[PDB]
Amino acid sequence: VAFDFDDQLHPTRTLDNEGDSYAWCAEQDPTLGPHPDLDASFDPNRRVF
Amino acid sequence: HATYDVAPLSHKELFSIYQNWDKTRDELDLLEEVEERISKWKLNKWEMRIPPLLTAREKELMRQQQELLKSIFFDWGKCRDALNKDLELISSITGLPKGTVREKNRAWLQEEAAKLRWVGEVSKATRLRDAFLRLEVYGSRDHRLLERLCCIYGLGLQGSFESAFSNYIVEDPITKKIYVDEKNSFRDLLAYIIHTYPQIDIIYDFLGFNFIGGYRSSLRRYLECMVSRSTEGEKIPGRLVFGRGKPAEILFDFGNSNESLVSGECTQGFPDFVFVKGSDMTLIIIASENSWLRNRQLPHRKQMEGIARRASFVLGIPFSEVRVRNLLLPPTYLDKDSIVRINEAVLGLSKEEQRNLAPWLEMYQKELDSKDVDFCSLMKSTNEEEWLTL
Amino acid sequence: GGPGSPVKGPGYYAPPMEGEHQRGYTAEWRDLKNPMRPPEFPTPWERKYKQ
Amino acid sequence: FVDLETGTSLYFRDTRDSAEAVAHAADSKGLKGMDNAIDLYNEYRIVP
Amino acid sequence: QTWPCTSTICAYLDVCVEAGEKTWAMEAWNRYCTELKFLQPGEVDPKPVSR
Amino acid sequence: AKVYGAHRLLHGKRERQGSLFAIANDVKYDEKRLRQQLNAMLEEERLPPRTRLERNKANGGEALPQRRLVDLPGVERRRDLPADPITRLFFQHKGDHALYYGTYDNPSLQDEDRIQIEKREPRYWTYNVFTPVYDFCHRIREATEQRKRFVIVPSTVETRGCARVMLGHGLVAGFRDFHNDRAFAVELKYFQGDSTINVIEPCAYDGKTEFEWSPKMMRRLMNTHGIHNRLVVYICRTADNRVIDHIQAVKENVGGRGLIMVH
Amino acid sequence: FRMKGGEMFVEYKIMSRDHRRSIRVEDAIVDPSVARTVVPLSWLEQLRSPSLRLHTGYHMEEAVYVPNAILAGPVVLSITGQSVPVVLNPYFVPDDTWGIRRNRDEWDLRL
Amino acid sequence: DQRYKGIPRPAITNLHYEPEWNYTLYRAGTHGSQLSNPRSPLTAEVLG
Amino acid sequence: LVWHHFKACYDACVEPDWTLPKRLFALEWIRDVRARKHGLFYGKMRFAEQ
Amino acid sequence: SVYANAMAQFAICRQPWNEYINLLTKQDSTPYHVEPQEKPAYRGRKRG
Amino acid sequence: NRGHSNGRVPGLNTPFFGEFDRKMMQAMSRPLNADRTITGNDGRFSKTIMINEPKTHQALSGKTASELSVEIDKATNAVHSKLTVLEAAQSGLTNYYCGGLNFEMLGFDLHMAEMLREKARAILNGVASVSSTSVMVTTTSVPTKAQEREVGQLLRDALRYEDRVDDAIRQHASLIWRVYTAPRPLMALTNGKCRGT
Amino acid sequence: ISDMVEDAGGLEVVPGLGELDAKGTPVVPPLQSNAHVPQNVSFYEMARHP
Amino acid sequence: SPFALRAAYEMLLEVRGDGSAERVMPLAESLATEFKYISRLLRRPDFYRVGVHTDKSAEAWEEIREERQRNLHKTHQPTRPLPDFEDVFERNVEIDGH
């Protein structure tokens, strides 16, 4: 719940299929890579073992 | 004073009571003789005016309507005092009497103002300018005539302020003499109003003075009139008011937008009055007060097509020429613009038929309040937010 | 004189709907003056105190 | 700072538009006020 | 700011009588004992206590 | 001499032998008019410019009480505060969804991507009863002790009250209310390696003990042995349901519930 | 302060002791021969600026003759050249017996 | 709506909404102190 | 500047105006006056008392 | 828009900056790449 | 059902316009305006002024430009302002830095001014009964005072909407000039298109 | 500007300033400026050498 | 718009002057010129009757067409004017080949 400076905070869980998370930067520069702050399966109720 | 045997009348009761037949009943003279009296009143004269012979329900709505009228009369009283200050300045600066003050042109204004500048009181010239300039707005003797007549009609609907204008010892002008009066100017003026505007009880709601249950029932009893006295005739099977001369000329008292709005089930479509005049359907919906609810009154295109095609079957009117529309009406009252666009756009009424049916629409000048203009502009929510907005 | 005093009350009337919202104007509407036009009566107010 | 030359151009950023700097449209030639050097001795002491 | 009931207006009016000043009584008349109307033939005489 | 800017005793008029009543009444009248004129001069001397900077800024009234102009469908609606949707703590939830927002105690279902703070409600008699004001102060204390940057801090009216005044007092690089019914984020400010919030304490380690501050109590903090000291900022929630520092609380002589001390 | 013929003409600004209401005099004469300033009575109200220290306008207000005038004070004169204010109790003569209007708009006021 | 539930308007409220109505009947010094202030013209003309 | 006016008046052999320090540091002058009136001391206020 | 056909023929899209940057020449380039090994992580005040 | 919980998010549901913000430099932004058309983000020696107005494509209204002309120089007059990064906080909803005047608003106000001029001349016999030309729409003297009394109101409100357009234009000119004559460094980090002004 | 006018003594409304007379001239002669470049205010002939 | 074209060209000429950097209009008087032009060109119904509504999106226009065709209070002497797609736009024009 508290984030450091140079440490990247949580990634935004994209929609399920995650085909359009790069198609919705079609407006953006053509060659953009996957966004590092995006995730298909980021669940913060994921209980680690 | 609200002594026993005295109870809040109705409009029929008021017509039967305050009906004496004289014709030298000048609207703007009886009204000014009533309003100056209510300006010389003092705040205890509003004290004993709730007839004690009522349940707890009606007594508080009585105090409610009463402090409404009382605020309204004090507004008019301060307006009229600032007005008599304006007339006094114009008269004291020019010499002309206040009587002839209320009709001088902007032409006379410029002429007299140049006169004033010639001898050197330009500050006084501008004082007269602004006095006259806003007196041109409010100095018309029938300035808010219809809502003065309506608040007086509410007063006379109380049964309490019936004697309070009379019997006052009064002093005379320079022939300094004391004498009781008897002229119940309220009796005269209310008789004149009841006898002149037999639809005054509908203008009352329309002007919003009927805060409890605002102008809806008045709108229905006005639509039924403007349809029955326009089309040859339109019966009362319950709430349906449709003709016999065989157009599809219906006015349908569908229901209550707001009671439906805030009642158990949430929908989006609920017209007040469905007016069908051949190929054209019109759903009149009285806007609500929850700006969070005015967003779910206008029916959706699914509804506006589902009424179109259901009507084209049942009403038999051909499909290509079926044009379902909406008409939103201001939430608590009705501005003259909305009465214009009820009659003209919705009903088939031309000026010589209106001026014959609703002869007071000429005096109506109620407009939209600034807090109220935005009732029609609804908030647009996309189709991915059906879970957030209303 | 602070908050513990008896209250001072509204130096006006507290009305409902059609009081000062564009209906008309009270006596507090003709005496108020726009800055451009001069005062009625002349005073030799200082510039420094004016500002 | 005075040694490392970088940034001494900003004191003459005003010559971006030649015509504008000659015209002297706005007095605000200064990096921090009206002049490049206004109160170099006091005003900078404002900082703790 | 109290409402002199019929008894109280009568009282003060006696006082005006004895002191011999009509003005003193004209205002009690103008203010309070105006909405006092005689018992018209149809209406009940001592309308009951209500509140 | 050409001048720019340009009597009852002198006319020596024979003073009217006013009756003892036409003397006493005018004595009382001049006395009362002088009293109220002195009160008016004291009112114009003790006038705060918060109110003096408007008497001659609101002169723009035309003489006519003119109609108010209708404008576009909406320009008077409050914008939302910008917040990037993809690199984010919570989406800055819109205002239109104002019927979607629940409460701190009972929150809605928003920001599924993110954890949710929990409440702080004890169990027995023997425990102190914490409160959002306590937990916000110790969230912030632990984060400034861990050199974090953003804290996700509980959201009650006087928690973000404390935050808006701390931010006004510079103890915090910023805050944000995402309208998240439960949380909101406080971005902390640092200096020379050490936190700017040197210490931050709750007025009460308990909730069951509300500490109303007398205006004199709050005036004896800004008075360190004769030196006026607005250094340590104290947040107190007045009677008007406002949350203000002790400095504006004693500039208007009202005291409020004690919320936090900080410096 | 100037002389045109030796006689000195000072520029000053007479001010209510609170410097609220003020009235300037471009070139007034300086006669070191009358031990009191004689300003027209019209300013007794222009410079009556009722403050708190002085409840009424002035502090001293006495019907004097030279009775022509109202000797009133204290009024804060301020001469252009000098930096020290000069506080006076001027005679306030009326403009009737003593029409101090010498020429077109001039005044015949002396320090 | 509670504004008029319960009880009516205590009608001295008009004593605020109306100033001409509230007065103090007998003046200030009548109860014998008219000559307290030595220098009021009240005393000056009473004594002489 | 105040030391300068003093050197100058001395050299013209005219009386100095000992109100020049006051007229140059008026802000500081009134701030000392109110500092005294507030914290009842005499002399001049030092930055430790601000 | 509604009627963009005229100048929309030669639209000037955005350039591939992400690609340009990723394909710049790096002072740390390696013939065969290897993911660096893990750094020491502070295990507590007991463990440093 | 239900799609995304926040409804319409600009990266997952609808297209993301503008720049990405992998910091929170716009999320932790303080409203310098009562309508929140501006938001602020100050460090210690810097000040970042982010126009927050994507619902109208950053097209500044007259009022917003009057507020911005003052927040820009309120920051470029502060003492701990070394640089003022002025920019647009496009929350993913626009690619615009600062659109022009809200020409929609200017059209609205102008059309209403002309609608009132027309409801006014739809009463009058003798708008042009005068001989000189400096005379403008209002105080068109009539020998009728049931028509003077109504047309004067309409013509005054016409003058008022025309002023509400005049003012948007003057506000925006003065805000360009606010930026131009700003004393301190005003780095207008132009991140996206920017129409006329 | 509204307060520059106030401290400027309000607008003096003089009738017919820029209004022209039949023969094309204006009534109420305009206000005329007396400004130029000062031709004897080089500061050097002032604070000269001693 | 054609009069827009000619206006904007004479605008450029006025802002430019002779063209030399000693008379290309500064910011002050450049913006004074621009104010004169856009001001005298808003008062033309070219703009606010037709030229405003062109920049609505092709979905905004439909959001308006549904309102204009279904809501009365938005059409008949409405509290605020709603533009007519056929007033603004003229289908299938032809000018010298285009």
PDB file of C-alpha atoms in Angstrom, chain B residues 41-44 47 60 63-64 67-68 70, chain H residues 1 3-4 8-9 11 14 17-18 20-21:
ATOM      1  CA  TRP B  41     -49.147  45.697   7.824  1.00  0.00           C
ATOM      2  CA  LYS B  42     -46.827  44.655  10.627  1.00  0.00           C
ATOM      3  CA  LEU B  43     -45.487  41.210  11.203  1.00  0.00           C
ATOM      4  CA  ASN B  44     -48.051  40.347  13.857  1.00  0.00           C
ATOM      5  CA  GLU B  47     -49.888  35.734  13.345  1.00  0.00           C
ATOM      6  CA  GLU B  60     -48.487  22.625   8.762  1.00  0.00           C
ATOM      7  CA  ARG B  63     -48.246  27.472   7.636  1.00  0.00           C
ATOM      8  CA  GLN B  64     -46.200  26.370   4.647  1.00  0.00           C
ATOM      9  CA  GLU B  67     -45.047  31.757   4.755  1.00  0.00           C
ATOM     10  CA  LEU B  68     -44.780  31.260   1.020  1.00  0.00           C
ATOM     11  CA  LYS B  70     -45.765  36.082   3.141  1.00  0.00           C
TER      12      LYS B  70
ATOM     13  CA  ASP H   1     -40.164  18.489   6.441  1.00  0.00           C
ATOM     14  CA  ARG H   3     -39.592  23.441   9.719  1.00  0.00           C
ATOM     15  CA  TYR H   4     -43.066  23.963  11.158  1.00  0.00           C
ATOM     16  CA  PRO H   8     -45.283  27.966  15.879  1.00  0.00           C
ATOM     17  CA  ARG H   9     -43.072  30.966  15.468  1.00  0.00           C
ATOM     18  CA  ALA H  11     -43.786  36.080  17.714  1.00  0.00           C
ATOM     19  CA  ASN H  14     -40.621  40.253  14.868  1.00  0.00           C
ATOM     20  CA  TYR H  17     -37.275  41.673  11.969  1.00  0.00           C
ATOM     21  CA  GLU H  18     -38.708  45.010  13.132  1.00  0.00           C
ATOM     22  CA  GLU H  20     -39.207  50.417  15.394  1.00  0.00           C
ATOM     23  CA  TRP H  21     -41.063  48.251  17.862  1.00  0.00           C
TER      24      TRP H  21
END
